[PDB]
Design a protein around this ligand. Sequence first.
Ligand SMILES: COc1ccc(OCCN2CC[C@H]3CCC[C@@H](C2=O)N3S(=O)(=O)c2ccc3ncsc3c2)cc1OC
Length: 128
Amino acid sequence: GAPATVTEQGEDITSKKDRGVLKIVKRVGNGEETPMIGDKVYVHYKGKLSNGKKFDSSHDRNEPFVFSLGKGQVIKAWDIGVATMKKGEICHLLCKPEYAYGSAGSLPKIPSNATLFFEIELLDFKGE
Ligand SMILES: COc1ccc(OCCN2CC[C@H]3CCC[C@@H](C2=O)N3S(=O)(=O)c2ccc3ncsc3c2)cc1OC
């Protein structure tokens, strides 16, 4: 399925080239501009654990998830991955725990040492 495919066929987008964050572009977005540090970014997403369980979805809430890029308001994989996206792009990200919740995990659903799968759509980005 999609998690296996990004694991086996994804591109390493980390600066360290340690394969901690792998990406596949599923829908090409608009133009050539990606957001910059500090921009307010609006995304839709769904996350799955490696046991197949969905652990989160903005779609199911009927509102986007909004954060300021590059400020550690989200897991490292998201700051790195969303920074590579164009407006309107949909991607898959496969996130090793060192770029996610590490040994701590995150209650109630994310265990220790969890590799996470996300589908992310970049809806919009704007400077404040
Ligand atoms: C500074 O480094 C951190 C920053 C934030 C952080 O957690 C809070 C931010 N955060 C929660 C929002 C959501 C979408 C952005 C992605 C992700 C998220 O980052 N979740 S998640 O999908 O991995 C997630 C994580 C836990 C969770 N529990 C119930 S639903 C749910 C969803 C954790 C951090 O280190 C572990």
